[PDB]
Amino acid sequence: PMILGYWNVRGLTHPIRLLLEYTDSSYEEKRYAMGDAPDYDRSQWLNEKFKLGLDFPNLPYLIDGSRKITQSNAIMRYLARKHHLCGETEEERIRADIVENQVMDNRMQLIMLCYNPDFEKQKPEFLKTIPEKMKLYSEFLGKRPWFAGDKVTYVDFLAYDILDQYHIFEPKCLDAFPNLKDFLARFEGLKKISAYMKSSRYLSTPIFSKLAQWSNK
Amino acid sequence: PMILGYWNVRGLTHPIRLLLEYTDSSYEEKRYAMGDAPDYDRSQWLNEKFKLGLDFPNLPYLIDGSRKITQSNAIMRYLARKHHLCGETEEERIRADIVENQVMDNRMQLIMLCYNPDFEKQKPEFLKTIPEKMKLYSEFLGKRPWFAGDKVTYVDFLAYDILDQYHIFEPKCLDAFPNLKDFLARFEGLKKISAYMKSSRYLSTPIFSKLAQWSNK
Numbered sequence: 187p188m189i190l191g192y193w194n195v196r197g198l199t200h201p202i203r204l205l206l207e208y209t210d211s212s213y214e215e216k217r218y219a220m221g222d223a224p225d226y227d228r229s230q231w232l233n234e235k236f237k238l239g240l241d242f243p244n245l246p247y248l249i250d251g252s253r254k255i256t257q258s259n260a261i262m263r264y265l266a267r268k269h270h271l272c273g274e275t276e277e278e279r280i281r282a283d284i285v286e287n288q289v290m291d292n293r294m295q296l297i298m299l300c301y302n303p304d305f306e307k308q309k310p311e312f313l314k315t316i317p318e319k320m321k322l323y324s325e326f327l328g329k330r331p332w333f334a335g336d337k338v339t340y341v342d343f344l345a346y347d348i349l350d351q352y353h354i355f356e357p358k359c360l361d362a363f364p365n366l367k368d369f370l371a372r373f374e375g376l377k378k379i380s381a382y383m384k385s386s387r388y389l390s391t392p393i394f395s396k397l398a399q400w401s402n403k
Numbered sequence: 404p405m406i407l408g409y410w411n412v413r414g415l416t417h418p419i420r421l422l423l424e425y426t427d428s429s430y431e432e433k434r435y436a437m438g439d440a441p442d443y444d445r446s447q448w449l450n451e452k453f454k455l456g457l458d459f460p461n462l463p464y465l466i467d468g469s470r471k472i473t474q475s476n477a478i479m480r481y482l483a484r485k486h487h488l489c490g491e492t493e494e495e496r497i498r499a500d501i502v503e504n505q506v507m508d509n510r511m512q513l514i515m516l517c518y519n520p521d522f523e524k525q526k527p528e529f530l531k532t533i534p535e536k537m538k539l540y541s542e543f544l545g546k547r548p549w550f551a552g553d554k555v556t557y558v559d560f561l562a563y564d565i566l567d568q569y570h571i572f573e574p575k576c577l578d579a580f581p582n583l584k585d586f587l588a589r590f591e592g593l594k595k596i597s598a599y600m601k602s603s604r605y606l607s608t609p610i611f612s613k614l615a616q617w618s619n620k
């Protein structure tokens with residue numbers, strides 16, 4: 187089987203776990219544990235960081251037979267290509283690229299708050315702008331069923347994830363944008379996904395390490 | 404022709420300016436200026452940010468007739484597909500995905516440092532990490548002439564860029580790595596690139612905006 191490595195948290199690997207399940211990939215997980223405050227030990231990871239044969243060691247990582255990958259985005263693309271979940275036309279490919287990249291940007295702005303020690307003072311305002319990001323997703327999506335075009339591609343897994351996290355941080359966000367509420371239910375409604383979500387394997391929260399200020403436990 | 408907008412700086416758009424050149428693309432640029440301390444005016448950009456017909460407005464952006472792209476990496480990829488600068492086999496495609504993403508990681512680390520109000524005191528720390536970074540790049544490339552295999556592809560434009568900025572920041576960071584200094588010469592050595600570097604269009608520094616601690620001019 188394949189091996190997926192990451193922190194025993196949701197964080198930025200949600201999209202990959204969803205995808206392995208969607209493609210019915212034969213995989214195993216290694217979920218590393220950090221230590222508690224004050225030191226939050228990383229030894230479980232660090233003891234083996236440099237012993238797996240990875241080009242640029244990091245988490246998440248993926249081992250598949252002789253193939254070893256790091257960089258969450260690269261792992262996504264590799265599975266996309268293996269099960270043919272990419273865009274078919276130049277139009278689709280260009281939407282996919284944009285969305286891949288956008289999600290990363292929004293994921294990071296989030297972290298950095300949820301990691302910003304003034305999480306609170308910063309909060310009110312941060313979520314002052316949560317709306318406008320959401321609006322960008324909505325108009326991009328329009329009336330299509332999937333982000334890239336006619337069928338499901340890798341990017342929907344990425345879009346699903348940040349939109350889910352958003353409506354966790356500001357439940358009242360999804361509100362003005364019904365096409366975003368429907369996407370989330372259509373994604374949640376894919377057979378293989380529905381089953382995963384009720385499984386023992388599923389890990390929705392926490393999103394960050396105990397180090398965070400939100401979804402840290 | 405094609406239009407490229409970005410700050411009148413190196414920033415993250417160096418790879419694009421280079422690829423447009425290598426490919427003999429007809430294009431013009433809009434180089435937005437930024438006010439000076441203590442307020443750093445952004446209005447030349449802000450006045451049109453929402454009037455270009457872009458899906459997720461940002462800098463840089465590429466208008467190619469009816470195709471409007473944002474996200475530096477998606478612009479890099481649209482150019483690569485158009486000019487056949489992609490990996491040709493699975494191997495090359497995985498190599499490229501990894502490097503693309505790793506570059507962005509190493510670019511963000513530098514930005515975070517150089518924007519930190521504690522530049523002076525934090526630098527010594529950052530300095531210590533360079534040797535490790537460079538080693539990973541050296542060993543990945545090994546003895547191949549370019550990042551993905553026997554042929555130039557778009558990731559070489561991104562790799563060049565990052566390796567060139569770290570070298571500017573820490574002149575002695577590449578001394579222990581032969582293959583990296585050679586890779587830099589091979590790339591600067593390409594016909595269309597030597598020619599552009601001497602042009603009135605060349606812009607190597609500043610690397611950052613006037614609100615950074617290093618190379619803000």
Ligand SMILES: N[C@@H](CCC(=O)N[C@@H](CSc1ccc([N+](=O)[O-])cc1[N+](=O)[O-])C(=O)NCC(=O)O)C(=O)O
Pocket residue numbers: 197198235243244245246256257258259297395504508
């Ligand atoms: N660009 C890479 C980012 C991977 C990454 O940063 N991994 C973090 C987890 S996420 C993360 C992402 C960004 C930041 N951050 O502070 O900017 C912190 C974390 N984190 O885990 O705490 C990790 O713990 N790496 C193992 C290692 O470095 O040895 C990817 O997309 O795969």
Ligand SMILES: N[C@@H](CCC(=O)N[C@@H](CSc1ccc([N+](=O)[O-])cc1[N+](=O)[O-])C(=O)NCC(=O)O)C(=O)O
Pocket residue numbers: 287291414415452460461462463473474475476511514
């Ligand atoms: N993912 C994007 C990042 C685009 C971006 O953040 N652009 C900046 C300049 S670079 C930059 C600027 C700020 C930060 N930042 O972390 O605050 C990071 C970067 N960067 O290059 O990573 C900009 O000025 N945008 C104009 C706007 O938003 O209206 C891209 O790859 O194109």
